[PDB]
Amino acid sequence: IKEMPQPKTFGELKNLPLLNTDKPVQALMKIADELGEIFKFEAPGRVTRYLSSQRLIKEACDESRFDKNLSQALKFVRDFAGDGLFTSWTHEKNWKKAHNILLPSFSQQAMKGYHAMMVDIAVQLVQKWERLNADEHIEVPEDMTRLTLDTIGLCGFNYRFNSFYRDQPHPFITSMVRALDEAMNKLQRANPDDPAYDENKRQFQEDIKVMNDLVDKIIADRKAQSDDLLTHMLNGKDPETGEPLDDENIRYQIITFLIAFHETVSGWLSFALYFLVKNPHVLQKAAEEAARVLVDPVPSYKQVKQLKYVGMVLNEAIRLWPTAPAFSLYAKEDTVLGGEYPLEKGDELMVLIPQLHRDKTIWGDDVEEFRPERFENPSAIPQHAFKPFGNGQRACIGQQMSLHEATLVLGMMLKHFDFEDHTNYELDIKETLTLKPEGFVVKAKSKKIPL
Amino acid sequence: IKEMPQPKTFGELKNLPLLNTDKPVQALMKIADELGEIFKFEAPGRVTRYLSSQRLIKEACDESRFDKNLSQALKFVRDFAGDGLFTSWTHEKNWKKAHNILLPSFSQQAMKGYHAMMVDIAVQLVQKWERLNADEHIEVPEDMTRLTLDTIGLCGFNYRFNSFYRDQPHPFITSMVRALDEAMNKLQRANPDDPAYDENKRQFQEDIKVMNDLVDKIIADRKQSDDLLTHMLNGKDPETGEPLDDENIRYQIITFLIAFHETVSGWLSFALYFLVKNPHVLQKAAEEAARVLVDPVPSYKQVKQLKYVGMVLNEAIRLWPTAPAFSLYAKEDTVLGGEYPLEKGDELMVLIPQLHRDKTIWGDDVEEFRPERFENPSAIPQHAFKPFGNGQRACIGQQMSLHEATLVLGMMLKHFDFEDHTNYELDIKETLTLKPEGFVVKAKSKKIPL
Amino acid sequence: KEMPQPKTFGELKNLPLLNTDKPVQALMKIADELGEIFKFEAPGRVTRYLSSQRLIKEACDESRFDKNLSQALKFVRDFAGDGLFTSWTHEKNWKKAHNILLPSFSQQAMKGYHAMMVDIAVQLVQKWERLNADEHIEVPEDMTRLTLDTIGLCGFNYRFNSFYRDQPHPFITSMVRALDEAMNKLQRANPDDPAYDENKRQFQEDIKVMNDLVDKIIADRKASGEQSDDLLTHMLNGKDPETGEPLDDENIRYQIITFLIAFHETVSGWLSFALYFLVKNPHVLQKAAEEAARVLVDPVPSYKQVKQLKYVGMVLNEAIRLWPTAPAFSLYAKEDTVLGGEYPLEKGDELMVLIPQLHRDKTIWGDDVEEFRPERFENPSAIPQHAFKPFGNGQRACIGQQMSLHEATLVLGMMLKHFDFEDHTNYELDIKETLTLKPEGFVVKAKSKKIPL
Amino acid sequence: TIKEMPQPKTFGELKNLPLLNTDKPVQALMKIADELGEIFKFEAPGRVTRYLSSQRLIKEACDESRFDKNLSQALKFVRDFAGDGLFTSWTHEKNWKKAHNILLPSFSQQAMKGYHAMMVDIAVQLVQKWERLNADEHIEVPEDMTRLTLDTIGLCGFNYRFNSFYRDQPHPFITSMVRALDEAMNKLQRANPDDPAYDENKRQFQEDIKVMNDLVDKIIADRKAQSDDLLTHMLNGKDPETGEPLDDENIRYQIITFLIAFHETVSGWLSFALYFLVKNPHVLQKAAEEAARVLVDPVPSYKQVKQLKYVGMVLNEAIRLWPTAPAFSLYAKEDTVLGGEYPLEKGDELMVLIPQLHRDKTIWGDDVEEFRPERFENPSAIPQHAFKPFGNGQRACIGQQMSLHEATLVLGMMLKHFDFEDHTNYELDIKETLTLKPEGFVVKAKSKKIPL
């Protein structure tokens, strides 16, 4: 009872050239604004539907009708993340297995344990920024990346990257960044066999070895003893099959966590810092809460949760630019979406989170303005209207940890510094598969409080 | 005595790679934002200084200290616009000659003369928008180009480009456009002799030929009309008694054609953008238009009384002045602002968009579209607002442009309600001028007839 | 029974294999590696490349196979339309134009074109006389000026005046660029990517350029009624015996484009190649120059005299054997059939004759296939049937074979009569490939023998 | 002064630099020489040089009392990872004459007898690889010559086993070297080396030097764990004026130097010979003839390698037509006049186009392009300085005897054991790094069924 909108198609190439930007997500957003809540996007070999209104999004988040689909994006990341929690299909050996082995390791009770090491990495950042000279500035995404990676490596696997002791990035991080870019780059390749991509292929494998070799370096330090993320993997057993996780799979989970945490949380903080320096009154409300609550030289686990405004900023940043901008679904059985669009079994849907988070119908007509005050009552927001961490059983396992980190770090930054948008930086959002601000720089004057 | 800041330089290429964007002006504004009111900009074989605070620009506008310089930009334009007014040196032969011959034709008294022909073109645009079907949209920069170009050919030269009767741009307009891109592109070539730049060198001569050709049919076909073109054929220099030679005239026509259509097309487009982005201001101007434009066709008198429409235009050109910069050189040794010593011949660049963002002058809300700043146009300090250049070398076409945009904007506001149906994000395309790219709207006609 | 096929790249088949600027030569190397036949697959199409006289002989059976419009020719049809070269044998305008024009390329017709042919030829000789001592000759560039001017004057009584220019006629640059675009579409897997927008639009403008002067020439003569006895009046006045009607204006415009392109592209390459092999084989140059001197006894050559340069004709034939400027033609099986007892073909299957490789079939030419020996052709009937097909086959064979040979023989004769040629650069053969073949950096210096015209 | 020197087409401030914007610079300089003759000026943005091609001028330029070895722009770029090694050092630099006198013993004819055995080891591995191929397959000639030449210099020279024949994608070191060498050539064409577009290139290059210094600098320690080899001569030899052995970092520069120069020159050299053999079947016959007659043991003897006279002649005739290191550079020690026609300021640069020298028609006769190895039957008939494939003077190629022995040995064994088919009718295509090798050259080989 409704023909679905579709953008300009270029011959046999369908809609693919339309996402021949350096900014595909943002290109999909611009399409969403022109065609409305749902549009078909077909490329050679695949077809999908992108949804942008909460009315259709809530139905797709009905777990009896739709199951998580591996988007072409995720299908290409699977070539180095394999059977990890992020890139495994729901119905498959290790998803449920790893899911129940690892879920205890991220429940609110796990956070109390990670808190000490999180603080460690957070002081290094504060000390680095403290120790900068006057004429210097801060490269925000890079230092957030230094932070996030160091924090997961210590909390999760008790491995010290020492990112703050390095100027050129780590070999691992560069391979991870190059691998993700390649996964993205395969989306626009109309035929991946063309010889033009031979060097691109050769490097892809060279970086997969670099990561896969290095992760086993993490494994060497232990069997050759501490309440940590890795221990649960080598040591937790399935209640039905009795076994632990395979050595090959434990690998993929590590790659997954390293990639997921360091990438998603880097954008998150950077965006929060971006929005703070652009909204100085919000900064004021957030900076004062920092001083009043963070009364110790270093924070305690209990003190973090009181930062009720710092948390609101983070959520409001994540509303506007969700660092994992999309998740994919398929129909378990034949169905009708919204009484208008019939779906055959196996058809793919794409939830375009940033555009869902821009539904005026839900948020009012100031969808675009950075106002953390929307979130004082998280309970007024309808169901499936704010889904930055996915949905259902395949929802983000790393939510409670990421939020702990972001709120922790942001608090200490606001407690210890004031930040000047000394360049009048125009937001430039880089798209690998995640989103991050690119070239964001600030200067920070230390408030002269000791640690 | 104050040492001047300079951004990052790359070996023998100096600051040249920093502008290896498709957006140099915008990249320079970014540099201005990091380095402050003035910075030195070095390229291979050249040096200039970019000024951004009203403190420095006011000095540089002393016609006793500084004269108009042909920036590297304009030096490349001189290859197809030659010694026309825009691309002339002040003291060269044809400038003051041509300037004093033509000023009468851009005086306020000529406007009453052009007004009919201007209305003619504007009715065409309005009828084009009325005749769209419901599902269709409007391509704003492209239709402003049809409008601005057709307007000057009819007012100036009684030539009908018929852009509204065409879907791919006119062959003249496209070569004229491609010539501008090459002038810009020559800015970025570290060595223009490289054979990679040979296909370009060939297209360039063909485009110069295309425009030079079209003009000469207009100019020769004349040898009964009181317009810019006969003023050129008949105007006489009071010292030598002769008109401009046919070559210089050709150069004036080319100059005007591009200069008007490029700046005025961008300008109207920016106004439409800022209006759809601030609907109260659209409301007030729409209300103001409806009350004043009370006849089926607007009159010359009524256009001076679209006082709010004019304020909008002033506020848009404040934000994005479609001709974004002018250049100056020091006539003799001096110090600029007590801090920066300058040798004779040293170059200055007025970065008009950054000047219009000097919080010191405009307040702390610079980035806001508020036409009410232009209630009292006398309230604004001198040398704070330079959209039309400066001095004797200031835009000779200010009235005509202002008259044009104001007439056109008003009729659109009287005749349509406009929908930003795509939530268009501003993307400003750079030739040498500025212009929004991909700006589209939907327009529902108010069914007022013409 | 299973046919060789070169290396395939995923869903892209063999197409990346000849993403060179020189496809024919890459195909010549596939044939060298894989032999008399190999399958060449592209997205959406399949063809078989044949190189042995054994298979070509069957492929020339007009009762079994007909002329196919190769993918290449399919793209040329975008501006050569319904011209003789790009017509299907069963299309309406083919047989029509064919029976109408054949007299205009006959031998009695050549006697008529000869003088205007001579006209362009003196223009070439004088330009070469009037050069100063230091300069060289840009050989392909001057052969192009000559061949184009000759077809325009002989065919259409139109003067391009190429010798009075440095920028080629505005038209020939389009005509050349259209050919390059036609060639360029061969390697584009996705023809729709927006990157080919400047290409596809420049293309449409170049077609506008060619049609303008061709429709001007065809209209300008439909007013002066002038009885030049040339291709153009023969097209305007000749009538089809079945419909009683002459060729439509749209179709004539296509034959002109066809003839301008066909003559200028094939013959200039041909002359260029002959001259290359001559300056590279000085003993052969001597014999031809001697025959040139002995026969060209008049201030300007006469038609009877041209018949008589038997050795330059053998040179020309030996040149077109090594590098046939039009390197391939295509056929399809009119019905299901088996080729050479090993390869069954369904009706409609496409075959491609790789003429350069055919002309190197050692079992036919002997063990010295690559040496330039014009003495192979002094007994022309000794050559087996379908062993030497530089002009195609059967009813679809080149209509301009005679006209071209006359031009080349005449022109080459005069060059040898009037100059001594020096390979002052030791030019290494570098063959540019558009749709036809021609050498690229070829230059020589020529000392005038001071014989007058 | 008498004679204004020719100069090819100039592109404004970019001079004639665009003339070598091929992937085949050397071949372009030949095409220019063929039209402008025995000498021409070649200008670049920051430099000017003169190319010599006639034996007449080259005989003068090889006067060691007037000219010395210059570092061409090319060799200046190799100096970034080969540093102070013999190939990239100035004569008056402190490590040249130092390293030169300690190493001459390791390449004297006397030294060869020792290298002979390990030379054979790698030589059989190659023969075994070819023997074990199935019939439908072919031989990728440059790749297998690169495998051999590198394994031989690495084994015979430093007792390190690369084991190239046990891998299909090339060694990381060799892939890094070739990419480092490619970067050196790639710079020659950049009139803007500061431009940001070259950041990934500058990055990768810096990573590639680390790769070489990694393995090589480990090898110097890995031996301190002493036999009689090139590395031992470097670790143990003493300079008589300061009495010191070579610098630890200088040795790293020599090893890198020797690995590259050998593997790049010798592999190219063998490949070219094989091309000429399969293209000249009668020469192939006579060459396999002597091979069959002399190579009478399951393994070659040192004496026997010397007793191949025609195989050596094919080698000489191969390097004549395509000398794998095609050029060397010189500077004027003082002001002087070249050929009585061209005056030179002190410090002016000369480039010898060895391929063009080796085509000087007045010297070799008019069949200069023909592959005729019998030109080398009487080597004393060849004029002094007409045939300089190994450079000139004290700066002459130190390894020419090692190289000739390897090429003679290997080429001999190939001719004994296989018959070769140009089964694809391969057209000669020259890959240019700084050195010259042929590309995509392939043959099929039918075994003569003979054991080792």
Ligand code: FDE
């Ligand atoms: C470590 C970590 C950290 C994190 C964080 C984050 C942030 C900030 C954001 C986010 C997100 C997300 N996630 Fe996240 N995260 C993580 C993780 C993860 C994992 C493992 C996963 C998978 C799970 C399942 O489902 O199985 C996720 C998950 C996730 C999601 C979903 C996806 C789909 O496709 O559905 C989302 C949307 N994550 N996230």
Ligand code: FDE
């Ligand atoms: C027609 C026309 C129109 C116009 C418009 C306009 C607009 C809208 C804006 C503008 C601007 C300008 N201008 Fe303009 N305009 C014109 C023009 C002109 C001229 C001619 C000139 C030059 C002047 C003199 O000096 O003479 C100008 C001018 C001008 C200027 C200045 C330049 C310099 O460098 O100095 C500026 C800034 N404009 N504009």
Ligand code: FDE
């Ligand atoms: C005008 C002219 C001239 C010429 C020349 C020549 C030369 C030198 C060479 C040649 C060739 C040829 N052709 Fe040549 N030609 C011509 C033409 C022609 C035509 C029209 C054709 C088609 C035919 C029919 O079909 O009808 C030809 C044709 C021809 C051929 C065939 C085609 C196919 O596809 O088969 C060939 C191979 N052609 N050719």
Ligand code: FDE
């Ligand atoms: C081991 C080795 C091996 C070799 C080989 C060879 C071959 C096959 C060829 C050759 C070559 C040469 N080298 Fe030689 N080689 C070597 C080496 C060398 C050295 C070390 C050098 C340097 C020495 C001097 O001079 O000091 C050379 C050296 C050489 C030379 C010279 C360089 C210049 O710059 O002068 C030449 C030309 N190589 N090579």
